[PDB]
Enzyme design. Sequence first.
Site, short mmCIF file in Angstrom:
data_model
loop_
_atom_site.label_atom_id
_atom_site.label_comp_id
_atom_site.label_asym_id
_atom_site.label_seq_id
_atom_site.Cartn_x
_atom_site.Cartn_y
_atom_site.Cartn_z
N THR A 273 -1.71 -17.32 -50.89
CA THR A 273 -3.06 -16.95 -51.32
C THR A 273 -3.07 -16.49 -52.77
O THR A 273 -4.12 -16.52 -53.42
CB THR A 273 -3.61 -15.84 -50.43
OG1 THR A 273 -2.83 -14.66 -50.59
CG2 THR A 273 -3.56 -16.28 -48.97
N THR A 274 -1.92 -16.06 -53.28
CA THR A 274 -1.74 -15.82 -54.70
C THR A 274 -0.86 -16.86 -55.38
O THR A 274 -0.96 -17.04 -56.60
CB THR A 274 -1.13 -14.43 -54.94
OG1 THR A 274 0.26 -14.45 -54.60
CG2 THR A 274 -1.83 -13.40 -54.07
#
Lengths: 354, 349, 521, 202, 524, 76
Positions: free
Chosen positions: E94-95
């Site tokens: 997600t990052t």
Amino acid sequence: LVVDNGSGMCKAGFAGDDAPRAVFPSGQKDSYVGDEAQSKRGILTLKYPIEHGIVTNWDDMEKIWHHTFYNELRVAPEEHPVLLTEAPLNPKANREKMTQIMFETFNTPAMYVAIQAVLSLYASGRTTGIVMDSGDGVTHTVPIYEGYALPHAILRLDLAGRDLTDYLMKILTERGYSFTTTAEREIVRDIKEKLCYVALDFEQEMATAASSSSLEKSYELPDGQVITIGNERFRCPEALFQPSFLGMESCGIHETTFNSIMKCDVDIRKDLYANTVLSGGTTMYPGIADRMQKEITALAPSTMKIKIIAPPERKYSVWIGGSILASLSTFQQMWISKQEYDESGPSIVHRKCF
Amino acid sequence: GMNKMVINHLEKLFVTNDAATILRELEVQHPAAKMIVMASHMQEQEVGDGTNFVLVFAGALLELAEELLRIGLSVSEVIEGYEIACRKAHEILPNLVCCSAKNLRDIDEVSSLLRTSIMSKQYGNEVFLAKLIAQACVSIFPDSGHFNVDNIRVCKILGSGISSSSVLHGMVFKKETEGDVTSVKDAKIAVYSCPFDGMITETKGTVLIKTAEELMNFSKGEENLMDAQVKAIADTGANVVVTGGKVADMALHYANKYNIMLVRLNSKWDLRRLCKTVGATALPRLTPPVLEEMGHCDSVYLSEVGDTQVVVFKHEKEDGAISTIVLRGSTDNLMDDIERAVDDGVNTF
Amino acid sequence: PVILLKEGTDSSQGIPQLVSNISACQVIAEAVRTTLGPRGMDKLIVDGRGKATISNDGATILKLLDVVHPAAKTLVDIAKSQDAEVGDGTTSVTLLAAEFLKQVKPYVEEGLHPQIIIRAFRTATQLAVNKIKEIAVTVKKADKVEQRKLLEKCAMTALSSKLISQQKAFFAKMVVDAVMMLDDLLQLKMIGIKKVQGGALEDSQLVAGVAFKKTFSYAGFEMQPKKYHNPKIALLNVELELKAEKDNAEIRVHTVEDYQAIVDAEWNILYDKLEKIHHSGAKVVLSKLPIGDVATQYFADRDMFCAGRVPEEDLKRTMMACGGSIQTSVNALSADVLGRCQVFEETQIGGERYNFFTGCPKAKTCTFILRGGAEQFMEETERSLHDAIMIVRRAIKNDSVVAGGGAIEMELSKYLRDYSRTIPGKQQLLIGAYAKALEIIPRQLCDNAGFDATNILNKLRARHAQGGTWYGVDINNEDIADNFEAFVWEPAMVRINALTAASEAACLIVSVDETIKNPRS
Amino acid sequence: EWNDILRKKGILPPKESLKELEEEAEEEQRILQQSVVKTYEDMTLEELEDHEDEFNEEDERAIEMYRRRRLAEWKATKLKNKFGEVLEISGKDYVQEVTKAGEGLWVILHLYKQGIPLCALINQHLSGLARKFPDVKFIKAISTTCIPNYPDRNLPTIFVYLEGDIKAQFIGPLVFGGMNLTRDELEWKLSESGAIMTDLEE
Amino acid sequence: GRPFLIIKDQDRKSRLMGLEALKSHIMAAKAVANTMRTSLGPNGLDKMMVDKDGDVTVTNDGATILSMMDVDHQIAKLMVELSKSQDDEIGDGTTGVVVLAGALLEEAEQLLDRGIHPIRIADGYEQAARVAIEHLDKISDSVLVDIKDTEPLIQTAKTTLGSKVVNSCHRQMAEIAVNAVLTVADMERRDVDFELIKVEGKVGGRLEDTKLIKGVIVDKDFSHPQMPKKVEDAKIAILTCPFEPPKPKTKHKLDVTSVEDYKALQKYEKEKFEEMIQQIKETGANLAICQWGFDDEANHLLLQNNLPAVRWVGGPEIELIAIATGGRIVPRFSELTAEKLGFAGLVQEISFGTTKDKMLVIEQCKNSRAVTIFIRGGNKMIIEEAKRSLHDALCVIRNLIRDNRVVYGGGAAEISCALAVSQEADKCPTLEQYAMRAFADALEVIPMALSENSGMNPIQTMTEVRARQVKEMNPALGIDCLHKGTNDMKQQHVIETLIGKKQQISLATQMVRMILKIDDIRKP
Amino acid sequence: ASLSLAPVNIFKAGADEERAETARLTSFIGAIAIGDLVKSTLGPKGMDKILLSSGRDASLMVTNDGATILKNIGVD
């Protein structure tokens, strides 16, 4: 005669006055002779014959009208043009029936009346802009362009603040201590007039009033108790906007307004876009304005802009409109007087032309 | 001439070269100007074309009046002077009548007659508009009645150049049918003026149920009675159904069961003109009519006209009683200008 | 004295206004002077509610734009006319209009009258249309597969100057298989799209059957079987829920036995409808109307599907797909009225559950499942594919096609100036200006591509002086080549409409004298 | 029409306002026109020498009174004309004139190092000023003997003193730099110090 | 000509166009990517932030962080949308994907100042993504997962919990997640809907208490609190109607024209009540599962009938109870019979001791379909963190339903794909090698930020690991994830998804290709 | 690398951030404030405090344990 049979009141002054001199509650001189004591107490007994925006009785109105300005207003209407109010919507039948009684018992020279929405629009200082006539018992939409109300453009919706309070007490049983009695109905309405605001929406308001409970307001009242977590307050406006709360699942009031504007030509809607003022009757709390603004903005194209207008006091608004129109100095061009009453009767009122 | 783009206080952009339309748009506060503009208004009412001629004539007369009265004349004598000259014109102008139009029927005849008034309008090519207007007008040539401007309708459509436009003997409307079928030829038309639902009595009607069977048979008998009424209507041989009031879905389903075209209009003008052009009648009840009071049409379609869909009533005989014109233009203002030019031509005719 | 009109007017006239008109138009064009052409550029506009939008076909943006000027509004309306007529190249049509106005500046400043000017436009446009029709493209094939191949080539062309030029073959064959699967009725309501977050362009798919979003379902759901190798569909326009009968059927009975009888009888109606549905032998019950919980509980007991209050578009697409028929009353179901399918199941696709139908013999409609990474991206794709659909629907009627690369303007200008030799007077002047306005376009295309046009423009003149046709400009190679052999083909009707409406607007704008502001009460 | 009815009732539009400002301004403009003749006989002190073009009648009461006040004014102003030559006192006494210089008498305490045309021209201007205002105490000297080892890059610095309080400062040539600097500009600056009342263009 | 209003209201009208617009894009996007740096993959930290209403929420689930921001610039909102897409697709990186996008646009802004059209950069990125994903699919190894072997899945989840505080216990969660997936999975359809699992958490307790319950949990107590509290194996029934007498959904006015009518109704009321009691008692089911509540008469009767029941039970929980018990839905006593009843394994009442909550669990002896996960921890922040982490884990397992859904991660994939990209790009003509090399650099960005986050001396770490994995080719030589030497990942075995990284690559490439094109701007 | 403010305003009104040791300082200052607010009361000879509301009848409650103390106060 600036007499105006309002929602439940009749207010008698003059066009030049800043206010009517007398009220209509539906012993000033009552200890000298008592002549008017009997007449005024008898008129006081008679009730208000207007409900839901349509006239329901006729003998009592003239009964009251006779006294109300023959015993305190001290005016001869034979030497005066006449300017009253009327129920928000009626067919021509009531209009041409009232003309008959007015003439046959007073024979006043001229007349003109207008819909309360027009008077409110004049009082706010507008000749344009549709007003949300959220009257008691029933609400209506009156898009006004230049002053005259369109007979093809009036919509009527059955919502009422009474209905909102009833639905609240229909979900106040779920609150534990329900409220149904006269005192309990009164306290529900009191709390509603204290706090039933709108922030944005139902679920997000309920989350911030239950998850964090920071929208709680403790009720320290002799007639109240701390039973609201911030839910019931906001629970009054929600059914005002979303029909399915009340169990009568239909379209939103915003939909009715949007259609009543779109059916007309787009150009004039621009002017209707201009002010788009509101009116009370069921709404008194803020959060209404911006919320309905964005809600109809969802229905409003981003290429065009919309404005929301709502004055805080609109109690004598119809009276202000009447006083203004009485000094408009052009309304006499539209007076219907004896020169036509004794010539055609009620036929011209029916607009035999067109 | 040259077009004069004007913007009203209502923010509608009027690109008008019609002096009558110009003055309608113009807002003037000089009372004499009001006199002159109303004079031109009634002039256009009586005749229609070249309202600016009256303007220029009045201006020339008034400047000469200013000149003579500055010379030192008095009002009366010169008033009778103009009046005598006017009546002299009254008598001498008929002597100048050169020709007279004949029979108003030959298509090129009326085309040339009307192209004169059209020529005061758009100059690039009037003869095309002349052909179209002549084709429209001559088709409806009254014999003993009176020609009316309501006997001709108009259909503007945004799209390609004006050359891709024609005329239609019949009517066209901006609607789409709820009927599962689309194209019928020699359809039998049953015009209806009553609301298409189950006829609702004018007084509050309340269902009163006591026993279970009342509920049990209620919907069944209701739909069966509805089916009986729609079947009786179908028995006339109708292929389309026209109504203006509120419609009920059960009727649509029944029509599907019988393959019936259904159309709903929205203007009383539409119903009146349709009855005028087909000979049908405004039926106050859903009961089937007789053959005499119905309208017959050669073909009805939902024909696509350029990524815009319209219900079309076309008569292949192209006799009817009312004809409309399909219009194709890149902008609305071009529509307005051509429409007013056609107005001048039809008033001429 | 007293003033004639109301206060607040404005009256500017003459050549001042005329020039002041043309200039305005110019502005708008240079705002979008880089979009069309298989290079392709993208804008971004955020307004009001903050809704961003991106596009390279100028009609959309200009609609998002809000402008108040008779010249500007005229440009907007002619652009929308081009949009609704056929489609793409709206950028090019507005650029051509501005090129017309810019080309004829000196004549406005010089001594010339609008009559000669406008008749020059009309004659030139007439001749241009005649040339277009006389040298229009015909394939001499009249074959279905070659039709589809040309449709794919023109679809890639439509995706040229768009954002998905890499996947042009993929979406091109996709939309061609979509349309050639349809009839020759040209109905455009039936090819709706169900848009999905996540996934890439190749992940976007076209459904032969029907896929629609599984709406809100009551308790007890998912108990129904989720796989049927031959189910039967029951489309409904009827509502199934325990409710009031007609809102006016008042009870006035006095025996509680009859009361319980009435309640049980209402249940009898409910279960009667249930049994009538069950005897149909079908498994798929859909509805535009709400469906009560008890109905779904019965279906779970009866081991079959349920769905209600679905939008009408969905049920109509389903009706056209499965070959069934919509019913309104449960009292008239037959063995052929119902819908029939080859496989029905509910699937999980990137975070949602949709209902899927496949194998239907009646292949007459389709729906798109779009897998994208950006809502802006998704809507740009939907509008581009809609443009491709429009191009295909125009072309299937007739192969009125023109090659890409903007060379078409070189054939137009060549023919105009070659014609603009015998005509005397300023008519020839106006025709020459009209030809140069056309000549500008591919230079507008290629200078955006980042290389000189002057030498290649002279090469274009040379190549077309003796019979060269559509030798357009290379895009990522910065050269010249025949787009008819480079297989980027736009419809001819596009350009015919473009130039006709351009002449319209030019003559219209040339033909004003003044303006009057009003107080705006 | 409607707007003025609004005006009687409400104040929602403003359009009747600000029509008093120019009214009052014109009133004062007409009022201020009598000051020219109010003091015609109250300003000139040569009107007696202006016989046969100033005399219409002599009441001998307020007009002899005017002579009396005028002569008192003249004697008061001419009893103070005692100066006119800028003088060079020494630093040994300096404490005695920084403080014991008279109260109510301005002191222009000039400090300089001779040699630069800046200081020379400033000294010229002040010496010439002494010819005009003999009611002002001028002081010039060498700052080295006034202030020990005073920075020679801080001259000429003008000092304005009275009762040991600095009222005005003009330090270095940073405010006098330039041979273009002139008589009237120096007089203007010393007037701006509050010592002199005169008029100059700039 | 004097300037004149062409565009409506040009006074408040702001336009940007050209290279400066790209400069604004790149600077904002680099700032965001560098903002979201320190949570990379297997090892990182957590960023804490408060939203408008004053709520504390901290995680490395980057999509939540980006979602709960009142950002200003459009490209950042686009980044948030991309993060939400990737999270709803896999749930890891997600990052990672946003840092990769930031790296790609770093390369884009470098090459931009070299004077090249953005079409070239987008084309280079697309080709490089093609090559990278192709090799990433060549290098992933198929994992043969059956119903009886779980150790590879246990290590998969264990590695996945890296940089996520739930790695405290780091072992039991993998087992309970695998068991839950196995219990609830629809094998033939390969489908797992997460609406079948009631992910619940209650503050207090410890992360050791993180458990899977092979049944259902309900949060309502006895209608009669004095009634006996717990029952072993039982039979339940699910009635969708209250115990009130049947009144129709049509407005009804029941006249009462006689006193004997009054007696008839007051007798019929109870007669219906005890008739319902007899009906439900006949079927023999121990438990009744209702939805709308009912009257106290039923409560006391069941007290005299000793037959447990509950009320006001919500819709989805009603459905889940029905799913787990194996029975069917009984709308009304007409459908009531001994057949469709649902058998109970055992049902019991707990109150969490000190708490005053009441909560019933249903644990089944026979086969179940809907399981429940409970959480015990430190606060609501702990509860939500565990919930989101385990939910992402369930997404990982659902992706892992198939084989070959795993490749060695921990950054080693980044080195491998960068190497493949460089190798392919080198054998190319000009005008493309620059963009492809830029993509390669963006690829080894991930290990650099990884080593930074670990606090390891970065540049030497990547140099040595690259040399080791170049001289001998393997997909397992990534940098130290457990920071204890043994960089051969055939020992540490970072076991993470394939499609997760592939989707991250695809999303980043498409998104940067998109952003490269917005060259002309307009704001009010 | 760490930089999220220099390029452009990526925040609306009232939106900020702090990356470096500043964030740690803020958090630790708050934590030590909490501790001194509470460590002044721990132990069998721990101490006691008074919690006072802002307006609205000034809710008064005496307490030794810090639970209600951290409930009432508005922590930032």
